[PDB]
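Notes for week 9. Today we move from apo structures to complexes. The key idea is that a small molecule is not decoration. When we ask for a structure prediction with zinc ion present, the ligand SMILES becomes part of the input, just like the chain. The input block below holds both the sequence and the ligand string. Read it once before you look at the output, and try to guess where the molecule might sit.
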Amino acid sequence: TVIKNETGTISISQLNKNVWVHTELGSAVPSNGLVLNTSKGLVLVDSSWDDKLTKELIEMVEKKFQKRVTDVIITHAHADCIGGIKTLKERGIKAHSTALTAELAKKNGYEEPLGDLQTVTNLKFGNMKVETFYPGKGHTEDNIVVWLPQYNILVGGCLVKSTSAKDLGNVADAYVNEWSTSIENVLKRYRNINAVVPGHGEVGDKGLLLHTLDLLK
Ligand SMILES: [Zn+2]
């Protein structure tokens, strides 16, 4: 099931009953995030490139599920994750992030996220269980990953590259050398990964991490 706008720049696909992947095209590069349908509202992982697309993504998602987006997990301080921050705060949406993501968001001129996530944080929204983990520096200094224990789905964000992506992308903010260590921790930490959602690209599996470590070699 893949619903999207009239323009084709915002689509949402279903991974499982309550787990969907949202995708928006911007600077055109596709960037994914998650949309979790819970008994107590909708929880998103990552917003979009800007407030226009973020608003629209939210408008869309809420109309479809007839629920309000209560929380969003910002995996890092780049426009494609925290770009719609101003929107989330005028709509009463709680934008969680590590303290680091928050200070770097302010640095890049974005409105500051909550900065509440610890290296390991377990959130439970109604029935949905979410875990955020900070494996260390990689694609960026602050990047974290999301683990849905009930579906064994790992959102690697931009720490994980896609199957046919042979470029690491913007490494000016990246710590190319520590990047590999960080994927090891994710790998060591979660020993029964099923699906893995990359920052840009198709949903893969634990193989996407190995692919990334390969591009880093
Ligand atoms: Zn990024």
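The two ends are 37 Å apart (CA to CA).
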